[PDB]
Symmetry: C3
Subunit: 485 residues, 3 copies
């Protein structure tokens, strides 16, 4: 006749590492690292991204003939660009502050193309001959759709003086450019005048562009270049152009309303008609876990990126194949409990109160570590050019330093807390064993294995009497007194 | 006749959370989060700020007529500027490298205006016509006080060639500028010469400026523009100017002595006459706590900013089981005993056990506070509209450290509070063990944290049990015959 | 008559602090902070540094006569410049994007100087008169060796139009330059061409340079200046120069193959002919420790820099559940017993319990060391005077991380030290409870961790209780009357 107190055992193969012990198989565990993604590019917080297909932001904006004339998506959360975009700037050249303009255009709440300077405005210049082979539409020479390459008319290029007053209530993005000639003959042939200039003026802008006529390498079959420039014209301000040649004049402009900032994501995954709080170039993370290892360049409210394959928190008990030699595989209905083997039968019992008290606390342990990382803001990727490598290395030092801080702190926290959890489980059993110690002072002997040697007989009902804390010690005290022999 | 053990209880309503348990009332606690500021702007480590009031750095350096002429103070710890300063470049234009100038001027050990090029130095040029409505003073057109807008004299503008050798043993901040005419007629009207230049050269400078005669939009009623430039002439170098028009010449310069940095603060709070090691745009912080939630953009040896409303550390016992709860009747300690005797009944406290615990939890709180390193850091936003990528980097940095310090501080608190509550429980159970070992069969294990005396213990006996000097041989026979 | 459960004591003078207790003398400890360096500049992962000595990256690159040697290292891992290199640009001027060039050049896999434009290519110009006293060689006017200063021939300077196609499969770093003369006479007496230009064109480059004839200050005896420029010619592109005069033309160029990044180190210590994974400006760190306090500016796979001077982890026990403890006699374990009978008295140790403690504390120490993730990094200052806002961002980032690692590492030591000392206390209590449970009735507990055998037990039964093989029915209640 004896009563026993032990812990639970199941068939789990999951192991956890603690600060002092490694590879400790436990009954229950919880990974706080997310490794699952959608494999698709989703909407970010309800807004659809801008997916440019093998075209760059410059190509799309300036109107490369090989790009969708109108995306007519007025709003986007992020811009999706392929790694090495194909079409780009068909006529060789450059766009000023490109990387800044891209940051400006990463998240837009209104985008609408408008016609600010119609070709009718150029009565003494040729608007139809400004085309090239480097800019093709269906094999045919063409040019950027949103600008106008003006050339001489009647061997004469009269000085242009045109102004546009932004009557709209929205800011305007206005793009224009300068054509660099190749020799003096080419200069006079397109623009009668040999010495040329472009002057651009707004309330904040004061620009003097002058063409550079030199020998250059051939790119897309052209040795000349075209440098482009942009400005943001505020409501009720006016832009003032003046030139006598080499002018790539604006024809269309863009109404921008910008309330937020994002980044240009470089990815090739397809739009999945989904929504997500966190987008990575490889797929979307819908998770609440504090840490992830999917991809560094996330956008949105994301878990912290760590260099870890697994971060498993123990939520259970040491599994089995110290007074309590091991756990009971037969106690399938509890975490802490009792065992009896009286004259009538032998059975396994579970301590509901002690069990729930621990299940609540251990889940509170996981939820605390999970939910205290409520610090989730917005994020960005890569945005620096070839002569900005020092700032790029700055961003990399930062990302790596944060990588090291989160990974050390997360891996150590799991190790420190898992040691405490397993200890917390050990202390719970010992207090239960001390509960029956005080209930059966001399009416039972200390066997030492977590079991108690009943001098007197207990029925299955007396066993539930030691359990339930409903046992009378003087009821059987004299029987134990005689059992001493 | 019985003896018991029990922990102290208060009227405290303070609640702490642990890693496994939430909303646990305690008798004592401490918040390691600073939440208060003095509501004023103060001297930082003894040095008064420079409060440009509705003036920008540009309009104070150049002489805007609506800004303060004199530099009252030769040194400052930080600059305070309003959000959208009203008096800035009154004539429309620009100041080169303005953010870097601002950063340079943000903390200065010595600033002193000096006249470098007297207005007498310009005999064949006009020194008095160079005003504008855009820069008004007392109802009349004026201009920046620290430079000169030279104009033609007798319909002629002789090519200027002037040099200034720095003989001041300290660096000099020198400013000049270029005037952008509006049309070829304006140009000859102010400077007879239609094509003009400005050549500035030092030991390190090689600059050539040319006006941009072009149609611009009216700002402050002018379509002209004035671009200003600057430089730091070293203590034995000379600056050489040459121009034949459009020259905004330097008249005054500043002797600079720079030994530290500390960004421009944007606040509208008034200057209280106080000192602080830590200044925010809303107020100053006088604290030794590790963490705070006052403002992101501090200056000085400040606590770490976190996104937390409170960081409370439990330093006491759980407030009102095996001990059946706490004793609100206990007044003179944290761990105590209960005499229940026919001679007398009362409460007593373990003097050493309590003091060992209050010293430890005090060491726990003091350790968390004292291990924080405070480095002088000036957090400010110093990037213009075409510098938004670098601003994003700074944001990511600020935001990352915020997320680290908040996560650590929140989890440190939860974790150490679970340990603090179990540390009180272990110290209590050790007192139960001391009494249990001294009286095995002489006392009875009631199980509710109390002992049942078979023997009748004097109030002198009761102290001996606490003193750890009970003699089981004294009346072990009493218990033998009592067990019936 | 007595057996006792006690712990080890030694003669260690090492103290560690804990979250609740300070200056706790322990038996064994481990400092996880590295403080020692060999005092030499070493190779990084088997690659030699490039130790420019009193020469700048521009002097070495452009071929300063005073620079001691031509190109000698074909691959490097980092560059070593002296704080203020003495040589640099012997003729006064500048080099465009010098700090971005120094970044690219910081870690180069392949580097080879090649002759791209021989002097035979300048028939109608003079390639021999392009010298200056500023570049002095051996007491004689000289000049940069990798670039040629072209001068008129027969009072004529015919326009240069020249193209170099990159026929190599490696990229080519090409440097050219422009000379700013001082007055219109010097311009004619050197280039016989009053208005001059320099156009440089590649597949990506489209430059126009025009001299600035202007009064400047004397540097190294020259009021003139030379501004140099560089570009990277890709493997099948060609560069095209055109120039009326003032051309400092490329003679030599460098084959570049770049496959990783580093930074430039400012140090004066010398090569030790050693190899390391981690390099500071004062020496090299060969350590697995997670934290170090040597220098902030490290290149390589380094530990985290912290401000602390001691991070001592505790691996043993307190030094003078036995109340006194402090058994200086025990030498072969941490936990053990002590016997007392007619044969004699001596100390014994528990092998199974002690070993699991040593396994545990060392696995903790290893876990703290081993869980640190080290990335290759290069901490250096790469910003100029008009970049001090970026420098501050760097400083804030560095200083922000220093504060993060210092606090967390300090609390880690403190928290885990106190938990380890207390877990050892649980282990000696596990031994006492095992002994007390077996001696159910035949023995009394004295209170000091010891047990009084009423029925005196000799050497033979001491091993049975120790081994857990104690036979309770074998000898029992022999002398109940010993208690009387
Ligand atoms: C307008 C044109 O086609 N010019 C070509 C030139 O013809 C001259 C003619 O226009 C003029 O009236 O009379 C002179 C003789 O007095 C010439 O007959 O002949 C050159 C020699 O072959 C051509 O150069 C070639 O240009 C090629 C590129 O063609 C395009 C281009 O597709 O980019 C043709 C475009 O029509 C033209 N654009 C405009 C707006 O007129 C451009 C433009 O000239 C350049 O892009 C500006 O730099 O050029 C190849 O580059 C080829 O290698 C080159 O020989 C002239 O195109
Ligand atoms: C010096 C002056 O007042 N010029 C005004 C000009 O008068 C000319 C006269 O100076 C010359 O001798 O003879 C010609 C005819 O042969 C003229 O009579 O007349 C212009 C037409 O109204 C004025 O333009 C107006 O300028 C306004 C601004 O006035 C100020 C200013 O307050 O900024 C007046 C200042 O005295 C003057 N500064 C200097 C140093 O002389 C400036 C200066 O001209 C500009 O700032 C340079 O761009 O202008 C308004 O802008 C108004 O809209 C405009 O019509 C000439 O001011
Ligand atoms: C060859 C000669 O005699 N030139 C005369 C000048 O030497 C003299 O002005 C003086 O120039 C001095 C430095 O002389 C060099 C130099 O840079 O070291 C000597 C070089 O031969 C010469 N290089 C060329 C390509 O001609 C060089 C060059 O002229 C300048 O560097 C152009 O910037 O000058 C020194 O700086 C003296 O302080 C200065 O007086 C002038 C004026 O008298 O007449 C020249 O004939
Ligand atoms: C463990 O027990 C569950 C009970 O449903 C069973 O489904 C599962 O297959 C078992 N796993 C192994 C490895 O036996
Ligand atoms: C340089 O060489 C290759 C092969 O000869 C040729 O394809 C290329 O066009 C050349 N580039 C120039 C600018 O001459
Ligand atoms: C643009 O139009 C409005 C209304 O006619 C006017 O007030 C404003 O001054 C104009 N801006 C410019 C630069 O012309
Ligand atoms: C996202 O994760 C939560 C649990 O973290 C889950 O309940 C939810 O179904 C997931 N979202 C989608 C679209 O499946
Ligand atoms: C709690 O007790 C103290 C005196 O011990 C008293 O000053 C204080 O007002 C009391 N607080 C409450 C809420 O009763
Ligand atoms: C400035 O003054 C001192 C003494 O007159 C002189 O030694 C120095 O060369 C001068 N510096 C310049 C750039 O003229
Ligand atoms: C700052 O705080 C301390 C501690 O509360 C206080 O004694 C003092 O009055 C305050 N004084 C100053 C100068 O900040
Ligand atoms: C402590 O004992 C060791 C021998 O193991 C000895 O080398 C050392 O000098 C001793 N230190 C002191 C302070 O006695
Ligand atoms: C680094 O330290 C260990 C231990 O002292 C040593 O065995 C090893 O030789 C050292 N390696 C180098 C390259 O110095």
């Amino acid at each position: 006749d004896q009563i026993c107190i032990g812990y639970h055992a199941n068939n789990s193969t999951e192991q956890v590492d603690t600060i002092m012990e490694k590879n400790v198989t436990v009954t229950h565990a919880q990974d706080i690292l997310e490794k699952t993604h959608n494999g698709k590019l989703c909407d970010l917080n309800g807004v659809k991204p801008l997916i440019l297909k093998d075209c760059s932001v410059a190509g799309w904006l300036l109107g490369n003939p090989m790009c969708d004339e109108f995306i007519r998506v007025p709003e986007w959360s992020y811009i999706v660009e392929r790694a090495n975009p194909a079409n780009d700037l068909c006529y060789p050249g450059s766009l000023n502050d490109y990387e800044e303009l891209k940051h400006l255009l990463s998240r837009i709440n209104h985008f609408e193309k408008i016609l600010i300077i119609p070709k009718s405005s150029w009565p003494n210049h040729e608007t139809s001959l400004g085309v090239s082979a480097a800019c093709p539409y269906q094999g045919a020479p063409s040019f950027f759709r949103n600008v106008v390459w003006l050339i001489k008319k009647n061997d004469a290029y009269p000085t242009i003086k045109i102004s546009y007053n932004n009557t709209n209530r929205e800011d305007l993005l206005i793009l224009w450019g300068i054509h660099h000639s190749n020799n003096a003959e080419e200069q006079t042939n397109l623009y009668k005048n040999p010495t040329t200039y472009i002057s651009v003026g707004t309330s904040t802008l004061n620009q003097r562009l002058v063409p550079k006529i030199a020998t250059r390498s051939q790119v897309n079959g052209q040795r000349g270049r075209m440098d482009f420039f942009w400005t943001i014209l505020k409501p009720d301000d006016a832009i003032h152009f003046e030139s006598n040649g080499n002018f790539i004049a604006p024809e269309y402009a863009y109404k921008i309303v910008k309330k937020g900032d994002s980044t240009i994501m470089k990815s090739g995954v397809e739009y999945g008609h989904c929504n997500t709080k966190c987008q990575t170039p490889v797929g979307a993370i819908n998770s609440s876990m504090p840490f992830h290892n999917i991809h560094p360049l996330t956008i949105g409210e994301c878990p912290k990126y760590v260099k870890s394959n697994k971060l498993v928190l123990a939520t259970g008990l040491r599994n089995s194949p110290g007074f309590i030699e091991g756990g009971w595989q037969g106690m399938v209905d509890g975490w802490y409990g009792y065992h009896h083997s009286n004259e009538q039968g032998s059975g396994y019992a579970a301590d509901k109160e002690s069990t729930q008290k621990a299940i609540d606390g251990v889940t509170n342990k996981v939820n605390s570590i999970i939910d205290k990382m409520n610090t989730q803001f917005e994020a960005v990727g890569r945005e620096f050019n070839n002569l900005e490598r020092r700032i790029e290395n700055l961003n990399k030092k930062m990302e790596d330093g944060f990588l090291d801080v989160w990974t050390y702190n997360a891996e150590l926290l799991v190790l420190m807390e898992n040691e405490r959890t397993l200890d917390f489980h050990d202390s719970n059993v010992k207090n239960l064993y001390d509960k029956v110690r005080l209930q059966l002072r001399d009416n039972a002997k200390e066997l030492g294995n977590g079991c108690f040697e009943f001098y007197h007989k207990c029925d299955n009902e007396c066993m539930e009497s030691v359990r339930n804390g409903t046992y009378d010690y003087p009821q059987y005290s004299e029987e134990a007194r005689l059992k001493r022999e």
